[PDB]
Structure 1
Amino acid sequence: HMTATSDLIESLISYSWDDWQVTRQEARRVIAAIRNDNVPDATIAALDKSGSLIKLFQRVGPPELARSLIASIAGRTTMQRYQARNALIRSLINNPLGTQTDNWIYFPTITFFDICADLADAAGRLGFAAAGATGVASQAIQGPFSGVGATGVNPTDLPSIAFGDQLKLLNKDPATVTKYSNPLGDLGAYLSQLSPQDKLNQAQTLVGQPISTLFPDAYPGNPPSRAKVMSAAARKYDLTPQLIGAIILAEQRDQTRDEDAKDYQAAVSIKSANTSIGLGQVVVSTAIKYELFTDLLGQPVRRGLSRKAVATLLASDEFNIFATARYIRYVANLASQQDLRKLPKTRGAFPSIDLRAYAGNPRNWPRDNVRALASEYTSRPWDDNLSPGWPMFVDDAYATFLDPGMRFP
C-alpha cells in the first residue's frame, strides 16, 4: 500500500518537467519527506512497486543531494533495505559517478549506501544515535590541541597543503617536517602551563562537541556528541569512557591542524602513506590488520574497502573512536597473554603492573596498567621497549577525566 510519503514523492516525480532530473528544490523536498517519514519501509516498498524508486535515484543528480538522499534511505530502512539497495544499483547504469565525489571519492556509491546502512544500525544497537552537544569547539588553527579533537574541523575538509610545502615535505625539509608533525617535545612542560581548569576545559571541549562525521544523514537527527560515542564504545569493549578519553586527549594535545592535513593528505596521495589519523591517531595499516571497524561495519563491506577508504573513515570521528577503543582492548587482551618475566623493562617502569587484570574492565586495573598501556598505545605493544614520556602524559589526561566535573551520558 502507498504511503503519504510515497504519494508525495510520486506526485513530485510525475509533475517534474524534465524526466532526467528533478530540481534542487524538489530534491530537498523529497529528502525532507524521507527524513520525516514514520513508515520508511512501507514508503520504499511502494516506490519500488510503481517503478518510482529507481527514478528517484536516477533523477537526484548533484552528488551532495544524492549523498543526503541515499544516506537518509539507507539509515531509515530495515526490512526493505535490500529493495532500496537494488534500485540504487539499477540506477547506476546511467550514473556511474553517484556519490563518489569530493570527500567521498574513495567510496563507490553502493559502498556509501552500505556504510550508511551499517552505521545507522550500529548507532541504534550500540546506543549513539542521538546526543545533545555539551561542549563548543576551539577556533585554534596552530599549536597543541588545534587538531579535529579541539576544533571539529574534519581532516578531509582542510585546504590542500600549499604546493611549496607539499614539495618540501616530499624532500624532507626539516623546518617543514616540523611544521606538519607532532607539536610537543617536552610533554611535562606543556602540562605545566595548563591550569586545572584549562585541563578540564580541554577535556569538556573534546568530548562535548558533536562528532565530525562524514555521514551525518545516516543519523536520525543531528550527530551525537563524542561523549555518547565514547560511552557506547566503552560498553562494547569493556573499557570506560574515561580511559578512551584520556588516550584521545593525549593524542589531541600532541596534534595540530597542519598535522591533521598532512595525516590525511599523505594517506590518500600517490604515496598511500601509512600515517596515524584522526582522534585516536590510528595507523592506516593497523586499522586494516586488526579489523578495527568490525563493530560498525559488516564483514563484506569491510573487506571491500580500499586502503584510501579506510584512511577516510579514520577521519570520521565515530569510526575513529570505535577503532581507538577496539585497539585499546586489543592491546589489553594481548598484555594479558604475556609473561612478565620476559618483560623486565616493562616491570621496571611499571612495577605494579598486573597482566591478568587487563582482561577485565579498567575500573579494576592498577594505575600502572593504564601507564603501561599508554606506552604500548603510542609504541609497538609488549616488545619491552617503552615510551619514556607518554605514560605520565596519558596519566595526567586520565586524572582530568576522573575529575568529578566530567560526566558521560
Structure 2
Amino acid sequence: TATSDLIESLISYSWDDWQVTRQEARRVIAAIRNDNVPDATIAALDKSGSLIKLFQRVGPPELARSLIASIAGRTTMQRYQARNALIRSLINNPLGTQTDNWIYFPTITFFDICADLADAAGRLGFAAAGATGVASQAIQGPFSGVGATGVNPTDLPSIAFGDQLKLLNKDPATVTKYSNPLGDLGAYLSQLSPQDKLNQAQTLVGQPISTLFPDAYPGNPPSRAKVMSAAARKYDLTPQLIGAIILAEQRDQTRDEDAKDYQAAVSIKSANTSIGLGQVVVSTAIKYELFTDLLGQPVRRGLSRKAVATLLASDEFNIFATARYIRYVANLASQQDLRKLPKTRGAFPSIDLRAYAGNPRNWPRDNVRALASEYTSRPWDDNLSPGWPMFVDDAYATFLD
C-alpha cells in the first residue's frame, strides 16, 4: 500500500545509517493513524518481512505505545500477524511498552488491551465523541478529583514525604486530609445553586475520558458522556443513573484522595482502595470481573492486581466497571426477600425489588435511593448509609432535569 511503502523506507537501515530517528518514528505513527487501508498495510509489511522490524525499530517506550495502540486499534483480519511480529520483536528485547504509567502491563498485554478496547468501543458505540464540557482547574477540596479535573490519578506526583510518614503513622488528621472531603453532605449541596450543580454535571460528563490508551481510539478520546451512554445500553441502565452515582462519588473526592487511592493500591501494601470515577474497589473488580465487556477472558484473568488498579484509573474501564457493578447490585436486590430487609423497607417504603431487574426508567425513586446506600456500603445486608441516598438522589434529580 501507499502506507506500507512509506513505512518501509522510514524504518529502513542504509550503509553507515542504522538508526531510525524520533522524527521518522513519529511519521510512521502518523502514517499508520491516517491509513485508510490498515489491514492491507499490515499484510504488505508482513509480506516484506518488515513487520517485525517496525516493532524492533520504534524504540522509545512512549512511541512504542503509540505505534502499538494504533496498530492494535485499526487492524482486524491482520491483527494476529501484527501480534505475532510484536511477540517476535520482544524476544531478548522485552522492555517494550512496560514503563511509567504502564509498568504493570507486559507489552503483549498492552497490545491485547488496546485491541479488545478498540473492538469494544466500535461494537458498543463509544469510539468517538467530541467534548461537550470543560475540565475544572481546581486542585483541592470537594470535586477536585479526576471527575472534575481530567487529571489522571496515575499522573499525580508521589505524596509528599512528610505526609507519607504521617499517613504511615496512622496520624488521624493526615488520614482525613487524604480521605473523603465531605462530612455534612447536605451542607455541601446547600453551597450549590441548581445551575452550579448542572455545571458540575456538564464538567463531569462532557470532558474527554482521561484514558491510558488514547491511541487505541481512531481519533481523539471520546467524552465520558458517550462511554456512560454505551455502558448504560450494555447493562440496561440509564446514563443519568450512572452519572448520578459517579457525580456523587466525585463531589466526595479530591486530588489528594486520588493520589492516595492509586498510590496505596500499587505500593508494597497493595491496599484495597476505591479508585477512579465510580470509586470501584480493586478486589471487587477482580471478584465480579468488572472489565468483562471491554477485555476478553485471557487478558482479564492474566492481569496482576496492580494492573487492575491501574485500569480503574482509566476512565472508560472505570465507567464500564461502575455500570456493571450497578447492574449487579440491582440484579442482586431483585433476588432478595423484602420481609428479610425490614430496615431497608423502613428507610425506603416505595422500594420495588422486582423492578430492579428492569430499566431504571421504571424504578421508583426509592429504588435509586436504596441502591445508592447499597453502592457506597455492602449491598443488601440491611445496614444503610444515612447520608448517601439523598446525596445521590440530588445528583440524579439534576441529571433527570
**Structure-1-length-normalised TM-score:** 0.97
**Native 8 Å contact 1:199 1:400 kept in 2:** yes
Cα deviation for residue 131 of structure 1 reads 0.3
Conserved? CA contact 2:198–2:398, under 8 Å: yes
Conservation of the 8 A alpha-carbon contact between 1:278 and 1:320: yes
- Report the alpha carbon displacement of residue 170 of structure 1 after superposing the two structures with TM: 1.1
Cα gap change, 1:15 to 1:369, in 2 (>3 Å): same
Judge conservation of contact 2:143–2:254 (CA < 8 Å) in 1: yes
Q: CA deviation at 1:94?
A: 3.4
Is this contact kept in 2: 1:20–1:58, CA < 8 A? Answer: no
Q: Report the Cα distance in structure 2 between the residues aligned to 1:368 and 1:47, rounded to whole angstroms.
A: 59
TM superposition shift of 1:175:
1.4
* Secondary structure, aligned partner of 1:172: coil
Q: What residue ranges of structure 2 are gaps of 5+ in the alignment?
A: none
Cα shift at 1:17: 6.5
The CA deviation string for residues 30-80 of structure 1, in whole angstroms up to 9 with x for no partner, is 000000111111111111111111001001110000000000000000011
Which residue does the alignment assign to 1:406? none
The one of 370, 395, 398 equivalent to 1:397 is 395
Q: Deviations over 1:287-315 (max 9, x none)?
A: 00000000000000000000000000000
Stretches (4+) displaced over 3 A: 15-21
Q: Does the CA contact (< 8 Å) of 1:187 and 1:393 recur in 2?
A: yes
What are the equivalent positions in structure 2 for 1:26-105 lying under 5 Å apart?
A: 26-105=24-103
Describe the superposition over 1:120-159 as per-residue Cα deviations: whole angstroms up to 9, x where unpaired.
Answer: 0000000000000010000100000000000000000001
Tell me, in whole angstroms, the C-alpha distance in 1 between the residues paired with 2:368 and 2:303: 33
Deviation of the 1:13 alpha carbon: 2.1
Fraction of identical pairs, as percent: 100
Say which SS state the counterpart of residue 368 (structure 2) adopts.
helix
In 2, Cα distance between the equivalents of 1:320 and 1:69?
24
| CA distance, structure 1, for counterparts of residue 350 and residue 263 of structure 2 | 41
- Equivalent pairs counted in the alignment come to 401
Residues 104, 304 of structure 2: 8 Å contact kept? yes
Name the CA distance, whole Å, in 1 between partners of 2:291 and 2:265: 18
Contact between 1:266 and 1:275, CA under 8 Å: does it hold in 2? yes
Q: What residue in structure 2 maps to residue 321 of structure 1?
A: 319
> 2:199 — aligned with what?
201
Residue 16 (structure 1) shift: 5.6
Secondary structure of 1:15's aligned partner: coil
Range 12-21 or range 225-234, more displaced: 12-21
Q: Distance in 2 between matches of 1:30 and 1:12?
A: 7
Residues 386, 93 of structure 1: CA spacing in aligned structure 2 closer, same or farther, 3 A cutoff? same
Counterparts in 2 of 1:331 and 1:26: CA distance versus 1, 3 Å: same
The structure-2 alpha-carbon separation of the partners of 1:325 and 1:18, relative to structure 1 and needing over 3 Å to count, comes to: farther
Larger deviation: 12-21 or 109-118?
12-21
Q: Give the superposition deviation at 1:20.
A: 5.8
Give, in whole Å, the separation in 2 of the partners of 1:61 and 1:368.
56
SS of the aligned residue for 1:318 comes to helix
User: SS where residue 288 of structure 1 aligns?
Assistant: helix
Distance in structure 1 (CA, Å) of the matches to 2:122 and 2:244 = 26
Closer, same or farther in 2 for the Cα pair 1:36/1:178, shift >3 Å? same
8 Å contact from structure 1 (residues 35, 72) kept in 2:
yes
1: CA distance, partners of 2:104 / 2:393: 37
Asked if structure 2 preserves the Cα contact closer than 8 Å seen for 1:21 and 1:58, the reply is no
Whether the 8 Å contact between 1:20 and 1:59 is mirrored in structure 2 is: no
CA contact (8 A) 2:163 2:174 kept: yes
The answer on whether the counterparts of 1:279 and 1:321 sit within 8 Å (CA) in structure 2 is yes
Q: CA deviation at 1:171?
A: 1.1
Deviations 1:351-380 (A, max 9, x none): 110000000000000000000000000000
Q: By how many angstroms is 1:15 displaced? A: 4.9
Structure 1 residues 228, 145: closer, same or farther in 2, change over 3 A? Answer: same
SS at match of 2:91: helix
The structure 2 residue matched to 1:234, chosen from 232, 235, 246, is 232
Change (3 A) 1:328 1:20: farther
1:381 corresponds to: 379
Q: Distance in 1 between matches of 2:256 and 2:71?
A: 36
* Cα deviation, residue 167, structure 1: 1.4
1:23 aligns with 2:21: yes
8 Å contact from structure 1 (residues 134, 209) kept in 2: yes
8 A Cα contact 1:16 1:22, kept in partner: no
Q: State the shift of 1:21 in Å.
A: 4.1
- Give the 3 Å change call, closer, same or farther, for CA 25–16 of structure 1 in structure 2: farther
Shift of 1:14: 2.4
Kindly indicate whether the alpha-carbon contact (under 8 Å) linking 2:10 and 2:25 is maintained by their aligned counterparts in 1: no
Partner SS state of residue 95, structure 2: coil
SS at match of 1:94: coil
Distance 2:220 2:239 in 1: 21
Shift of the 18–56 alpha-carbon distance from structure 1 to 2, 3 Å rule, reads farther
Instruction: Report the counterpart of residue 7 of structure 1 in structure 2.
Output: 5
